[PDB]
Design a protein around this ligand. Structure first.
Ligand SMILES: COC(=O)[C@H]1[C@H]2C[C@@H]3c4[nH]c5cc(OC)ccc5c4CCN3C[C@H]2C[C@@H](OC(=O)c2cc(OC)c(OC)c(OC)c2)[C@@H]1OC
Ligand SMILES: C[n+]1ccc(-c2ccccc2)cc1
Lengths: 375, 383
């Protein structure tokens, strides 16, 4: 029924965020277990983190005609089985080579699910009013999974073993399988307005993209924190992000969207600058919460601007914003860690954070162009 | 004793900067007895001459102390207000402005040097200069309506005579406490302190912020008349929130700078002033400028109170303990924006436009802020 498909889509997006948010606090300690020596492996961890983004980009434009030719349910099956396989090898992987294949399979399955589930939700809901509510429910489940995934793997690593969280995620995925069993984008990427908005979103999310694969190694090398607080350190970045996106989605229309994006990028730069100063775990709640709140600001201010820009000058569909918005996230999560590993090899982590903050601040006042576009 | 020195510097900045703003609503109306180009140069006469006298006042403080320059500044300010009280021609109204500029430069450099000298603790030093900037903001806020009501109700010679009497009282207080009747440490030459990157960053920060309230003030009434079509009684009232927010910001952030962080304070102030300048030209009425002007004044007070004690902190960290030249550089940074702004702002507005000028200033401040992170912890000199 209509509630069943929404439930399975919500659970699928939940697991999709759970896997990506549980990989981040496990892989560096996983490499530490078999063996300061992460300065040489930071590049390989950056490539392993950018593999999913690069695979999602390479398989992005192929699922379009595939869903039209063979329907929407069939591409669901491939994505779910591939993500089940990626989960099962991730709990069972022992070497660096298997992790890359697991990440590529996870990226392909994430792309297939993100296409097929939203396509099904659009197809089922033809009432023209409940579709937006279902999309909001899916986004809320996405945020809930983002919140839950970060403390999960770090807490259940040194306490209940290593394969426990991945096996639990695979078992939860098996539950959803039984429930489920019963103006193109290249034409929209030539005007300056949409390109500026996409660049703003990408440069806003690149900070949290670079914070993932390079922060735990810095924490282990300097702060001497235990192995269970590494996943807890990212909790403010999720909680503050959720409160910020709710509040500023409420409040952004009053004080202007372009000012929202400008102030959000500025506070992103300031938070990233203030991040590498703390010498204890308690010095990271401020900057991380600020960065999450700022990313909520920039996303909630840039999505309606993208929608209005597409509507005013071009003809749009139910999911025009999803194609462009997922492009900016893919550039962010693909160009963040791969370049960040080489940057940390050549120069220090604080220099990388200063560079990211400087880029965000310098790109900040280019959002003046987006105020009142013409026709 | 050390508490009374702050009272002397507080009074000195109050009287000198009150004369700066009292003559504003008296000169263009009484001069009448094309025009903007010359009347505008008269308002900028103090800034041009004060910038020149700063390099000749800095090294002078190392050889004769901080008392004689302050007494000379008081005497020059009294002479300037006396000359303003009786002059009634365009030629005689320029020498008085030049004398007021010389006295203002002398008083500012001597007072800041003395305040740096007496107060040694950095956290303690961050409050005296905050209250001094608050007194300066109070003088700039109260000079305009006092002189306006005095001219409108009692005459042209009334407020200048009252300011002269207040200057006499201030000089009597100065003779009472300071007794203006050579430093052991030989301070570094001024040319060497212009090579330290931190000093240049701080001076550029103060100079850029002081370029925003400057290039906004003379060119704002013209755009208001051209677009909003407002009556004559709102042009003065538009800039009042900037002064009020400047006073509040300078006091509170002189309190808060030692706690929250000097470099973060300067960076947030620069970002706020840049965004305020960006959002200024979007207003479609007088009520659209209440917010951006208040943010601009608060951010400028933030930057000023953050970058005042940092100069003395750097001078103690690296160079010898002599504070005259660094605050001479600070006054040069303060006066450069005020001497460049009024004389050319109409030219830039006629050439490219007021919104483009605001966007350029805004963008220079937003695209300059991340350079401040360098003042987090300068390395010390070799032992
Ligand atoms: C990895 O998972 C993601 O990439 C999601 C998030 C990325 C990023 C992030 N990762 C973290 C990991 C942490 O632990 C280490 C801690 C903090 C963070 C933060 C804080 C900040 N944060 C933002 C998250 C945003 C999510 O995207 C959407 O919410 C979304 C919403 C829509 O509706 C408006 C869309 O349609 C238009 C849409 O389509 C493109 C996507 C995005 O993809 C689903
Ligand atoms: C030296 N100085 C003069 C004027 C100001 C000022 C700033 C904002 C609003 C009004 C005055 C600040 C400093």
């Amino acid at each position: 029924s209509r509630q069943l498909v929404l439930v399975v889509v919500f659970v699928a997006l939940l697991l999709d965020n759970m896997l990506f948010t549980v990989v981040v606090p496990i892989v560096p300690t996983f490499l530490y277990d078999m063996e300061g020596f992460l300065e040489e492996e930071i590049t390989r961890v950056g490539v392993l983190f950018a593999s999913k983004a690069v695979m999602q980009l390479l398989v992005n434009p192929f699922v379009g005609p595939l869903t039209n030719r063979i329907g929407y349910h069939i591409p669901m099956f491939a994505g779910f089985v591939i993500m089940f396989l990626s989960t099962v090898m991730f709990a069972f992987s022992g070497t660096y080579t298997l992790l890359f294949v697991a990440r590529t399979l996870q990226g392909i399955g994430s792309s297939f699910s993100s296409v097929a589930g939203l396509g099904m939700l659009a197809s089922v809901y033809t009432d023209d009013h409940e579709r937006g509510r279902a999309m909001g429910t899916a986004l809320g489940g996405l945020a809930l999974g983002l919140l839950v995934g970060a403390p999960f793997g770090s807490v259940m690593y040194e306490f209940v073993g290593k394969s426990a969280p991945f096996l639990i995620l695979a078992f939860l995925a098996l539950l959803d399988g039984a429930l489920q069993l019963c103006t193109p984008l290249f034409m929209l990427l030539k005007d300056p307005y949409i390109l500026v908005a996409a660049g703003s979103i990408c440069f806003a999310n690149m900070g949290v993209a670079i914070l993932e694969p390079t922060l735990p190694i810095w924490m282990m090398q300097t702060m001497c924190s235990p192995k269970w607080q590494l996943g807890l350190a990212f909790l403010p970045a999720s909680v503050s992000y959720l409160i910020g996106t709710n509040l500023f989605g409420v409040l952004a229309n009053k004080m202007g969207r372009w000012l929202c994006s400008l102030i959000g990028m500025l506070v992103v730069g300031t938070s990233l600058l203030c991040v590498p100063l703390a010498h204890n775990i308690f010095g990271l709640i401020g900057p991380n919460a600020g960065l999450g709140l700022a990313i909520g600001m920039v996303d909630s201010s840039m999505m309606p601007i993208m929608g209005h820009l597409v509507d005013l000058r071009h003809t749009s569909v139910y999911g025009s914003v999803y194609a462009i918005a997922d492009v900016a996230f893919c550039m962010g999560f693909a160009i963040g860690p791969s370049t960040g590993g080489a940057i940390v090899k050549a120069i220090g982590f604080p220099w990388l954070m200063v560079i990211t903050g400087v880029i965000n601040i310098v790109y900040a006042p280019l959002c003046y162009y987006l105020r009142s576009p013409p026709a």
